[PDB]
Design a protein around this ligand. Sequence first.
Ligand SMILES: O=S(=O)(O)c1ccc([NH+]=C2C=CC(=C(c3ccc(Nc4cccc(S(=O)(=O)O)c4)cc3)c3ccc(Nc4cccc(S(=O)(=O)O)c4)cc3)C=C2)cc1
Length: 444
Amino acid sequence: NSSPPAVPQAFQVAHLHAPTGSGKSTKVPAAYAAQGYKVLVLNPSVAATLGFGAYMSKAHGVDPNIRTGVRTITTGAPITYSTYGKFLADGGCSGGAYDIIMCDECHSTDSTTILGIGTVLDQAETAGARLVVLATATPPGSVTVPHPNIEEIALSNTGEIPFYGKAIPIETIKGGRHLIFCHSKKKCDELAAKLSALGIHAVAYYRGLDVSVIPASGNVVVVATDALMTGFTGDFDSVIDCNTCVTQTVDFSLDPTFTIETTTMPQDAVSRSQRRGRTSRGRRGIYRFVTPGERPSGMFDSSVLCECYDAGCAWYELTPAETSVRLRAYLNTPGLPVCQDHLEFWESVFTGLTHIDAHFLSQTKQAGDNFPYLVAYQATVCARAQAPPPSWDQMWKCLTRLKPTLHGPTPLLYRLGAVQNEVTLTHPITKYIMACMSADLEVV
Ligand SMILES: O=S(=O)(O)c1ccc([NH+]=C2C=CC(=C(c3ccc(Nc4cccc(S(=O)(=O)O)c4)cc3)c3ccc(Nc4cccc(S(=O)(=O)O)c4)cc3)C=C2)cc1
């Protein structure tokens, strides 16, 4: 729906589909507050959370409470803005705290948002909340739609420059400023170089480099990865999309258990719109693609589920069972992103990961990398077996100081990236996870 759901006598979960800026996260809550309700707005971004608070006090004479992982500001106002992570850090809902609870960007598929939303969905009513709103500008199942200012031209085989099974006719990049999207930070160099060697001024671009490496004037063909901003100065004439992106995915490769790496999946609606949106700003744009079909938005990998249990164990003092109750509340609620139901599986997996090294965990938590609990656990297992990590990549930095006293094969519990060192598959925990996969009628 495009209108703020009225407040119900008892309870209700409603949906709010509105664009960013129409005031769905500010004006809407302000109205609920003018009515005497106490409102809590959750968002994935610290910046956004701050953005709403500023807007509110500056436009509606209301200095709302703002809560983030860094700190919380309390003004005693009836409106409160918090990040999902801080909300969870806080234990979730607090009795008699809020009448309404809006879950903004509820289409987000990062583990913190999903877990946070599950939490709201499960505790809201017990918490005395009368209403829970699932707000978002990108409803699940969305598809890229036609834009009034963008001409979409499909790539064909004709063209000297080969491009993902299709071709890029030189004619289309000779003159003007064009943005080409490639999936791998490498594939970029492969293209920028082929075009530079054809008279075409092309400057590659991917994570690491600087914005400066992109002249702001004169013809140019920028071959980049999604590293390029979404709000950065577009002013592009045409964008060529490879229609594929790199994303985190879980593979039950039975070697010995599972693998969580980054794979290239077909691009989805949200992705397609964002890349296409890099053209036709203040003028008419061109959009060339290799593939028309796209996966609708609102779908996420099983590995995010894993990421949710990992987080419940690492930061929120949540047993794998508690996480499940919360994640289940999320899967039973229609209108939110979907994923294969692997709750039982992941639950049983983390449950077996007991007696984790506190110091290692604390090291992975603040280190900031993904899956701090699984990294720390694989390390705990390693140290206890005086074995080295699967690799000496930054991932395993918490084991650097014992490097000397670590010999023999690595007791691989699972694969979280490149595994160089030799590996043994005889560890009880490895055997425990292997069995978790066999005990499942939807896993293996
Ligand atoms: O819908 S509503 O009508 O209710 C409404 C009302 C008011 C709104 N205000 C906003 C204000 C700011 C922002 C974001 C933001 C974007 C850029 C920012 N830039 C600064 C630049 C210079 C100085 C500052 S300073 O000094 O911190 O004040 C900030 C700051 C904040 C900001 C924008 C997009 C963001 N995008 C992300 C995209 C991907 C991932 C993330 S993540 O960090 O992973 O959460 C964030 C993050 C932050 C978003 C919204 C917004 C909406």
